Structure 1
Amino acid sequence: KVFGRCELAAAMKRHGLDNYRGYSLGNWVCAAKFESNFNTQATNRNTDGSTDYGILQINSRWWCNDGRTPGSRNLCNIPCSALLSSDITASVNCAKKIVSDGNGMNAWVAWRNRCKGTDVQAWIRGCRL
């Protein structure tokens, strides 16, 4: 569905993202805002034939299988369709893989461009967590 800011912060916290690999919860909330506008069903097609799926716009060249990304991997071991659920469990679990893969949150270029270097704790301000 389309989360509200504080709603998503609480859900991400329940699913273990607050400080996962050293990134505080506002980083994840800011990344979801700028990757998908909090929308679990967002998709975006890329010039390379891959597509970004779901709330954290996880990409089919590396991380999920969509059957239409030629030459791609599936390092989260999941169909990309699983990442378009209104329940964030699969997206969070795959994001945990991605952020642990040695490049931090730089995997999310909307995060790198629009969140990193800003006061990301503001994204959880006033939320009841």
Structure 2
Amino acid sequence: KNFERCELARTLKRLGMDGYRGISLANWMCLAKWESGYNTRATNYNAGDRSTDYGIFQINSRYWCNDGKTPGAVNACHLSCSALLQDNIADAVACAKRVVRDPQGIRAWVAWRNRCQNRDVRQYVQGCGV
């Protein structure tokens, strides 16, 4: 499913993402935008280390979810990577929260550092009623 901007903003807000561990909704939107373009079915195989990024947040199989084909991987979110490919983003949001509970916080995603950190992210939630 490809979410429309404001639709996603409220979906994330209802899921408890607004200010989760100090992370604003605009930051989460900027993350999803640059990671998948708001596409829940987005996937990226990393030939270099044999891992795969799944869903709207492009969560990696090496540490977060289990797909059974990533060498020496763990499943910190305790989810089949398949759960990160559903139209319903509840499980992906639960896993994204797990990711940020670690020391790096939102910085875990390099794309957030590249395109959201110290950037004007207000545009992501303007007019969405959040």
TM-score (structure 1 length as normaliser): 0.98
TM alignment of 1:38-77, pairs within 5 A = 38-46=38-46, 47-77=48-78
The superposition leaves residues 10-58 of structure 1 with CA deviations (integer Å, 9 ceiling, x where unpaired) of 0000000000000100000000000001000000011200000000000
Shift of 1:120: 1.5
Shift of 1:109: 1.2
Percent identity for Structure 1 against Structure 2:
60
* Unaligned 5+ runs, structure 2: none
Which residue number corresponds to residue 25 of structure 1? Answer: 25
Aligned residues: 129
Q: Which amino acid in structure 2 is aligned with residue 17 of structure 1?
A: M
1:85-121 per-residue CA deviation (whole Å, 9 max, x = no partner) reads 0000010000001001111111111111001111112
Residue in 1 that maps onto 2:98: 97
In structure 2, what residue type is equivalent to 1:85? Q
* Correspondence 1:16 to 2:16: yes
Structure-2 separation of matches of 1:119 and 1:13: 20
- Between the aligned partners of 1:115 and 1:4, the Cα distance in structure 2 is 19
Q: Gapped runs of 5+ residues in structure 1?
A: none
- Segments of 4+ moved more than 3 angstroms: none
User: Aligned partners of 2:115, 2:69: CA distance in 1, in Å?
Assistant: 30
The amino acid of 2:30's aligned partner reads C
Query: Does the residue aligned with 2:82 lie in a helix, a strand or coil?
Result: helix
Matched to 1:20, the amino acid is: Y
Q: Distance in 2 between matches of 1:50 and 1:113?
A: 21
| Offset from partner CA, 1:41-77 (integer Å, 9 cap, x none) | 0000112000000000000000000010010010000
